[PDB]
């Protein structure tokens, strides 16, 4: 539970070698509405494969 001899800022870096946020670059474009949602999701205006699905 304790540290006896403080690790350098070197090894503090290499522990942070894998924290990097996964990119969500894979956007989609609508079939018959042309707008952009996230893939397998709905827009801000209720479109999903060219349908007013939620009408909100």
């Amino acid at each position: 539970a304790v540290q006896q001899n403080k690790p350098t800022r070197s090894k503090r870096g290499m522990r942070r070698s894998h924290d990097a946020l996964t990119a969500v670059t894979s956007l989609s474009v609508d079939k018959t509405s042309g707008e952009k949602h996230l893939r397998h999701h709905i827009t801000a205006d209720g479109y999903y494969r060219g349908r007013k699905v939620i009408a909100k």
């Binding site: 942070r16 924290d19 946020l21 990119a23 969500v24 670059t25 956007l27 952009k36």
Partner: protein
Amino acid sequence: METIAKHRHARSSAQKVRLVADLIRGKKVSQALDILTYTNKKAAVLVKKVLESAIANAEHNDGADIDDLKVTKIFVDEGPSMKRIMPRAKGRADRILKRTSHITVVVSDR
């Protein structure tokens, strides 16, 4: 022509804003707005509210061009601390320091 926008004293820590403002290093703006609109975090609330304020400083003060407009440098740097006192058990306290951070967004056409 070059322009810079800064949010000073953003109420978080440096590694919390370093992680999403690592992806938008070396990007164009419209792919950066689209990688920050759908990153599910709090720093993506922070700097995406400021990264759009940087392109405002282009279209208004510097180069109105936004289509082919790059982001050159972005580096979140530390700020002050709100050193409150946290109570730990058995009578002893604990000097908490609520962290605070500064972010620059630098926008130009290299």
